Design a protein around this nucleic acid. Structure first.
Ligand SMILES: [Mg+2]
Ligand SMILES: [Mg+2]
Ligand SMILES: [Mg+2]
Ligand SMILES: [Mg+2]
Ligand SMILES: [Mg+2]
Ligand SMILES: [Mg+2]
Ligand SMILES: [Mg+2]
Ligand SMILES: [Mg+2]
Ligand SMILES: [Mg+2]
Ligand SMILES: [Mg+2]
Ligand SMILES: [Mg+2]
Ligand SMILES: [Mg+2]
Ligand SMILES: [Mg+2]
Ligand SMILES: [Mg+2]
Ligand SMILES: [Mg+2]
Ligand SMILES: [Mg+2]
Ligand SMILES: [Mg+2]
Ligand SMILES: [Mg+2]
Ligand SMILES: [Mg+2]
Ligand SMILES: [Mg+2]
Ligand SMILES: [Mg+2]
Ligand SMILES: [Mg+2]
Ligand SMILES: [Mg+2]
Ligand SMILES: [Mg+2]
Ligand SMILES: [Mg+2]
Ligand SMILES: [Mg+2]
Ligand SMILES: [Mg+2]
Ligand SMILES: [Mg+2]
Ligand SMILES: [Mg+2]
Ligand SMILES: [Mg+2]
Ligand SMILES: [Mg+2]
Ligand SMILES: [Mg+2]
Ligand SMILES: [Mg+2]
Ligand SMILES: [Mg+2]
Ligand SMILES: [Mg+2]
Ligand SMILES: [Mg+2]
Ligand SMILES: [Mg+2]
Ligand SMILES: [Mg+2]
Ligand SMILES: [Mg+2]
Ligand SMILES: [Mg+2]
Ligand SMILES: [Mg+2]
Ligand SMILES: [Mg+2]
Ligand SMILES: [Zn+2]
Lengths: 224, 83, 211, 127, 115, 100, 140, 100
RNA sequence: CCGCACAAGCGGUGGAGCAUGUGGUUUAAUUCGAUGCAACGCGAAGAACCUUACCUGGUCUUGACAUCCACGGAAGUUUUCAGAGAUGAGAAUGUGCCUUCGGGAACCGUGAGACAGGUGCUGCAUGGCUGUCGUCAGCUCGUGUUGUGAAAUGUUGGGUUAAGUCCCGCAACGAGCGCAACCCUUAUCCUUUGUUGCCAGCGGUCCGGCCGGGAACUCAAAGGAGACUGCCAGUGAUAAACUGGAGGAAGGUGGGGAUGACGUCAAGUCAUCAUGGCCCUUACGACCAGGGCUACACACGUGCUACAAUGGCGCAUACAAAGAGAAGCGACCUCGCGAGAGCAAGCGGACCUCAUAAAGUGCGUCGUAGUCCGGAUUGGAGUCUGCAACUCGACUCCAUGAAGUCGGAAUCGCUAGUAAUCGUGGAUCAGAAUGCCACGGUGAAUACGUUCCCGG
């Protein structure tokens, strides 16, 4: 991945000048049309280093978790993770995922229990309404936990689409001390991202570039 | 009231007492608790002290009372006016 | 907010009756009275044997009694020496030939009645009440792995003013009717009077009817 | 050939047999008017034939028991409707639109404790 | 039409008419009509004099009004002077055959007045 | 010719149908001719009692007892049948009446 | 009510004439569920009306009713927290209902020897616009 | 109920049982249509002599367990209270709460 | 944010007579408890004796009721006298049974105590049971998270519901007791079995499913099927959800019942029973007869029947459901004006009896009245249960015909097979239902709406 590929993908977009954020001025590419712009030449080295780190982690079979809560990116993160056999979150981030994982384990257990009843087909024992009721409950549980039901514990590293919208996951990651690989943009702080991937977090083409590069990195690294 | 097929009613002991008295002519009052017995004609002219829950009330028998119950001539409740 | 009897609601759904003899009106009342006398005797004699329940039948003009206790040896005696006496006396009072059967309670902790009688005994021996509640409940959870609740009320600890405390673990879905709720109560006398004890022990869900 | 129908209403029940004929009817071996003094019941029972204009083409044999006069009348009407559907099912659409096909289910409500009638309770003391 | 001394029955169904006589209820009225062999529903007018005469003789069998009242009075006087319970509760103007008196005695006691 | 009529009463419907099951299968394996088990209308008693030691007039509950009926008829009482069906016995809860 | 509001109940048409209005009439006239008595009264009254007042029975009834129908009433609403004695136009259903109620209520008072006769007289006067249901309209 | 009450009841029942036949016979005589007047008179007079408690009418049903004189049901011989609790135990065969 | 809470409708109460409960008064006694709601046709599902706990008088003192010791006799049966009875006194009588052959078991009597006995006090010493807010939608915990902490979040917000019901949002994620569901009952169909239940097509019939016969139908009782916003349209934030439509016996909790979260009222019950503890033992214990609980200037609550032509009376003639029955229910026939009486079949009950439903409908009559309305009250004369109907029972016949002509202030119930109105059954029970618990017949009116009254 190179600078002009990034430009074409819109990685350099930012946000219109907004109030009270002089923190990001250092390293700002600039601005045009009343919206800030990112320096892609900071990204190239930082982005490549992030991918190198992820390659190293994959080489040691690290469990990457792909969290996407920014709307357009949720299905893309699911695609990327499942291509990699990795776990993912594609909904609202449930606060306390890590700090309160103790609770999540029980939801995983009960999900698998109802699934087992499904294979058993013993819902036929119940009155018709209650059979349908249990089926619907199972459907909701599958919808929610489907991406993490195989994770079996706290992940090794986190991929985050946008610090600006996954910030609760960043808070929990910092609390526990889990490395975060995320896209960092104007109107977003590098704080809490261990291997920052400078670049626009909004553009869907930029998201596609990030996800493709990251999934390729995971599979290449785990395959060395 | 008492059926006619049954006939009138009287307590035995009262019957014996009154019979003995009338045949003896003792003609002095007879203490009794049998409110429930009926007056027969042969008892006319006697006097019966009939128990009223508290006290045996003297009563002098005359033909007009024949067929009445003894208790009907001895009130059991008292009353003299609320005011 | 008085609640209904847990066993009564579930009779004929998951709980069977304790007396399954047929009769007509000409015999019903005295059959019941004889059953009352029989139980009122057996409890008095078997107080020490830790008896839970007695179910009576009257097949073919004869009375058959089955007893559930946690330890048969105490009641069955050596070579049936004493049980025979029970058979004789129950035959006498029942006025019919008698037959006795023994069923062995295997987990006395998970029996409501036995738990309650243990608690009453411990109270009568002035064991501090809440300690007994705690140990009873924890034992129940260790073995049966299903919900339990305990209630105690009276002049606790000889307090001037009587009051009630209670304790729960796990699910106790009373309003549910599939629930196989075991329920019982027991009595304890003290210098200060009476202290009641009631116990519920959930043990799982019945699907498919009592059949 | 012959066709049948069963009707019920309140506590009553009725058996209906229908056959091609000039239009004579009998209920419990009595004529319709003999079995019903009230003038309403007669239309109440004949409405289905009127609706499909079958009045002079089928003869009826009726047996009914239970409930009162009104309930019987309704039961017979329902039975006739069903019998007609058996004869010619194409009549189903208009018979339903008329409301004749529906089994009325309204029944008396039991008395309850403390209420001297179902949903009737003594006057409040007002103390 | 005049019957039983001074009674002048109004012109209505013969039966309703005759009941006017004090001592003649519905049953006695039918009895009298049947005895006289007259239709019950004829008006009191259009009777021949002889028919009214046979009715006079018919009613002569039963107790005429005045002696009926006299006999009632004598019965009650006998009870009063005998001094039995029933006589006492006649002379006191209270219910005579066992009705409660804490309430519901106005027809015998009369309209309410303050204590 | 002869005919056996048996009437059964109980409070458990399932139990009494089982009873009929045994009766009929024995009547079959013994080779007798049987009218099928005919259900008959079941009586039910109802009672109600005040539930409070110190009375509240409104506060009362209700209970009922249901007694079921089955009937069986045998129109070919072959000799071995007759004694055989007196060799059978039923559970305590079931009341049996036989007649000729 | 506070939570909810619902529509009015359906009723059968009159079985002799096929008009629902007449069925509603017999219902308002009915007492203690003696429907047959009420309908006998109403049929006799309408019969004698047609043979003595107007040309035809149902039409005579309808015209007598029309001569009486109220349009407006002052019955209250209070949304402001204070009572409104506000004149408000009346739905046609309520117009007919009020007219029918008034006419039967007057017949109850008219006092002739029989109810069918009272009703026929009140209704004849109403066709003559003298039936006091007109007054019950006019006061409102 | 005081012990004296149940004592009275048991004494009444026993004593009444004793003279059942004699009372029945003398009633037969007294009620007979064609009996001689003198015989009926003697029978009526003699009836008085028997112990008053002989008459079955004087007996009162009481709860077997407790002997309460009110709220009695002949079906069970128990009061409304004890029958209810015993039912709740489920010791009465086939009894169940009614919901129809 | 809501509810027969108000409004809109219908019918009552408050005036009359009477049934019933309470207060007050009275009495020898009118036994005791219950008091806003949430006491007052309440405990009591049934007081003439009994019941009965109260009153008067007559009696007993290890006792009516239980164990223990001694002593004496089987038991028991029949019968006489005195007394209101309790009891006392006597007569014949029994005179037996297991007996290891000792006696003992049986019972019954006397004596001795240890003890018996209590509806005597405390529901503010308690258990148990129940009412009340209220079938109201709420009440909490764990982990996590924020504040120095006291704590908070969850449980608030925007929608949506009968609902803390569900969706979205949201530093919270879940869990438990409640909600709903699992249970009974009702609405439609299918399978199984057809007598004592059934009679469409057949044969015979005196015409009676009467009987030959039938297994169709109704019905009986076991097991199945069926309704889920499943389908369609619109609406809505594509959310949930809402509105309409199709089909269907049934449509949005199809209808009714059971089921009462944490807790409030030191609410009720020591008189069902249990019990802490205080009190009485020739008496606060026990037996017996009569009386009382039913009184009567009063007044308060809940009911029944009326003041009438949508009716009263006479004649004829239709259509139910659900229950009970062995000392029971009791037909038929005969007798009586009648309540009833005599005789006596059948049935432990789909078979027999209670037991012919009333409103309804057809005919006639009454003519707006204190009446052919209303029935209270009183006199006379009878039947039936019971040892016994005076105080104090129910019912029948004749006679008598109060008050009352739609009822203040003011107030109660009800949203559909409901209100209203008409009959039938059951428990308690020798006898004693205007009360209570059930069953069916006929069968409405009204709801703008939420502001006021009211209570979450
Ligand atoms: Mg008399
Ligand atoms: Mg309860
Ligand atoms: Mg439709
Ligand atoms: Mg009440
Ligand atoms: Mg009695
Ligand atoms: Mg709310
Ligand atoms: Mg209103
Ligand atoms: Mg009044
Ligand atoms: Mg007054
Ligand atoms: Mg009192
Ligand atoms: Mg003597
Ligand atoms: Mg002694
Ligand atoms: Mg004491
Ligand atoms: Mg008190
Ligand atoms: Mg209390
Ligand atoms: Mg208190
Ligand atoms: Mg809350
Ligand atoms: Mg609710
Ligand atoms: Mg919930
Ligand atoms: Mg939330
Ligand atoms: Mg034929
Ligand atoms: Mg078949
Ligand atoms: Mg079924
Ligand atoms: Mg549904
Ligand atoms: Mg629809
Ligand atoms: Mg429901
Ligand atoms: Mg349902
Ligand atoms: Mg529920
Ligand atoms: Mg007391
Ligand atoms: Mg006495
Ligand atoms: Mg009283
Ligand atoms: Mg009259
Ligand atoms: Mg019939
Ligand atoms: Mg009875
Ligand atoms: Mg005769
Ligand atoms: Mg029966
Ligand atoms: Mg009867
Ligand atoms: Mg008539
Ligand atoms: Mg008279
Ligand atoms: Mg007057
Ligand atoms: Mg009634
Ligand atoms: Mg009804
Ligand atoms: Zn961005």
């Amino acid at each position: 991945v190179s600078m002009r590929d990034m430009l074409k993908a819109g990685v350099h977009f930012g946000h219109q000048t907004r109030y009270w954020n002089p923190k990001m001025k250092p390293f700002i590419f600039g601005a045009r049309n009343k919206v800030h712009i990112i320096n892609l030449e900071k990204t190239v080295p930082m982005f490549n280093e992030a991918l190198a780190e992820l390659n190293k982690i994959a080489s040691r079979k690290g469990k990457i978790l792909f969290v996407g809560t920014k709307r357009a990116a949720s299905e893309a993160v699911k695609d990327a993770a499942l291509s990699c056999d990795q776990f993912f979150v594609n909904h609202r981030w449930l606060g306390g995922m890590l700090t309160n994982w103790k609770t999540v384990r029980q939801s995983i257990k009960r999900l698998k229990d109802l699934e087992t009843q499904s294979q058993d087909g013993t819902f036929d024992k119940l009155t018709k309404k209650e059979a349908l009721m249990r089926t619907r409950e199972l459907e909701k549980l599958e919808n929610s936990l489907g991406g993490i039901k195989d994770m079996g514990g706290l992940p090794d590293a986190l991929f985050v689409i946008d610090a600006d919208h996954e910030h609760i996951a960043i808070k929990e990651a910092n609390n526990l001390g889990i490395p975060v690989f995320a896209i960092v943009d104007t109107n977003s702080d590098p704080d809490g991202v261990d291997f920052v991937i400078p670049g626009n977090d909004d553009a869907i083409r930029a998201v596609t570039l990030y996800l493709g590069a990251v999934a390729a990195t995971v599979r290449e690294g785990r395959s060395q | 009231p008492r059926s006619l097929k049954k006939g009138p009613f009287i307590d035995l002991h009262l019957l014996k007492k009154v019979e003995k008295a009338v045949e003896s002519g003792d003609k002095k009052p007879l203490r009794t608790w049998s409110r429930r017995s009926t007056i027969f004609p042969n008892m006319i002219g006697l006097t019966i002290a009939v128990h009223n829950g508290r006290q045996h009330v003297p009563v002098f028998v005359t033909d007009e009372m024949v067929g009445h119950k003894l208790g009907e001539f001895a009130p059991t409740r008292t009353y003299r006016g609320h005011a | 907010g008085q609640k209904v009897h847990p066993n009564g609601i579930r009779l004929g759904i998951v709980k069977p009756w304790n007396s399954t003899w047929f009769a007509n009106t000409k015999e019903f009342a005295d059959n019941l009275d004889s059953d009352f006398k029989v139980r009122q005797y057996l409890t008095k004699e078997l107080a020490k044997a830790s008896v839970s329940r007695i179910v009576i039948e009257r097949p073919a003009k004869s009375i058959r009694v089955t007893i559930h206790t946690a330890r048969p040896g105490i009641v069955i005696g050596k070579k049936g020496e004493d049980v025979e006496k029970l058979r004789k006396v129950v035959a006498d009072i029942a006025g019919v030939p008698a037959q006795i059967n023994i069923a062995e309670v295997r987990k006395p902790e998970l029996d409501a009645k036995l738990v309650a009688d243990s608690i009453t005994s411990q109270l009568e021996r002035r064991v501090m009440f809440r300690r007994a509640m705690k140990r009873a409940v924890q034992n129940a959870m260790r073995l049966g792995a299903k919900g339990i609740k305990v209630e105690v009320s009276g002049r606790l600890g000889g307090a001037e003013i009587a009051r009630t405390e209670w304790y729960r673990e796990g699910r106790v879905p009373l309003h549910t009717l599939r629930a196989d709720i075991d329920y019982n109560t027991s009595e304890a006398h003290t210098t200060y009077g009476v202290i009641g004890v009631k116990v519920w022990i959930f043990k799982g869900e019945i699907l498919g009817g009592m059949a | 050939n012959q066709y049948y129908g069963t009707g019920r209403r309140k506590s009553s029940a009725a058996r209906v047999f229908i056959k091609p004929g000039n239009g004579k009817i009998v209920i419990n071996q009595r004529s319709l008017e003999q079995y019903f003094g009230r003038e309403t019941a007669r239309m109440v029972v004949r409405q289905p034939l009127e609706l499909v204009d079958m009045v002079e083409k089928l003869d009826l044999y009726i047996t009914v028991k239970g409930g009162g006069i009104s309930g019987q009348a309704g039961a017979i009407r329902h039975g006739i409707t069903r019998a007609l559907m058996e004869y010619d099912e194409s009549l189903r659409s208009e018979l339903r639109k008329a409301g004749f096909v529906t089994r009325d289910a309204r029944q008396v409500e039991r008395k309850k404790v403390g209420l001297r009638k179902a949903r009737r309770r003594p006057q409040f003391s007002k103390r | 039409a005049r019957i039983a001394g001074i009674n002048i029955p109004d012109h209505k169904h013969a039966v309703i008419a005759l009941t006017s006589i004090y001592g003649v209820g519905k049953t006695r009225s039918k009895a009298i009509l049947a005895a006289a062999g007259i239709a019950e529903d004829v008006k009191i007018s259009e009777l021949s004099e002889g028919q009214i005469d046979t009715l006079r003789d018919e009613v002569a069998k039963f107790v005429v009004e005045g002696d009926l009242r006299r006999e009632i009075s004598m019965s009650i006087k006998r009870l009063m002077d005998l001094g039995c319970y029933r006589g006492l509760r006649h002379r006191r103007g209270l219910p005579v055959r066992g009705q409660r008196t804490k309430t519901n005695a106005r027809t015998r006691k009369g309209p309410r007045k303050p204590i | 010719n002869q005919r056996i009529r048996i009437r059964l009463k109980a409070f458990d419907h399932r139990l009494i149908d089982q009873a009929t099951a045994e009766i009929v299968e024995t009547a079959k394996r013994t080779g007798a001719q049987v009218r099928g088990p005919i259900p008959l209308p079941t009586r039910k008693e109802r009672f109600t009692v005040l539930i409070s030691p110190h009375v509240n007039k409104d506060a009362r509950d209700q209970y009922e007892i249901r007694t079921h009926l089955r009937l069986v008829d045998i129109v070919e009482p072959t000799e071995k049948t007759v004694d055989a069906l007196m060799r059978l016995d039923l559970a305590a809860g079931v009341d049996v009446q036989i007649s000729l | 009510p506070r939570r909810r509001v619902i529509g009015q109940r359906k009723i059968l048409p009159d079985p002799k004439f096929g008009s629902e209005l007449l069925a509603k009439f017999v219902n308002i006239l009915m007492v203690d569920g003696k429907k047959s008595t009420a309908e006998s009264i109403v049929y006799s009254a309408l019969e004698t009306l047609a043979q003595r007042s107007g040309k035809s029975e149902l039409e005579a009834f309808e015209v007598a009713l029309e001569n009486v129908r109220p349009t407006v009433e002052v019955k209250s609403r209070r949304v402001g927290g204070s009572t409104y004695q506000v004149p408000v136009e009346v739905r046609p259903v309520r117009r007919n209902a009020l007219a029918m109620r008034w006419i039967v209520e007057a017949a109850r008072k008219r006092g002739d020897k029989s109810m069918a006769l009272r009703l026929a007289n009140e209704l004849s006067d109403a066709a003559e616009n003298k039936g006091t249901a007109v007054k019950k309209r006019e006061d409102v | 109920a005081k012990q004296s009450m149940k004592a009275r009841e048991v004494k009444r029942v026993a004593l009444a049982d004793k003279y059942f036949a004699k009372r029945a016979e003398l009633k037969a005589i007294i009620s007979d249509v064609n009996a001689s007047d003198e015989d009926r008179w003697n029978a009526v007079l003699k009836l008085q002599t028997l112990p008053r408690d002989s008459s079955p009418s004087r007996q009162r049903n009481r709860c077997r367990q407790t002997g309460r004189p009110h709220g009695f049901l002949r079906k069970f011989g128990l009061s409304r209270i004890k029958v209810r609790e015993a039912a709740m135990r489920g010791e009465i065969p086939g009894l169940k709460k009614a919901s129809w």
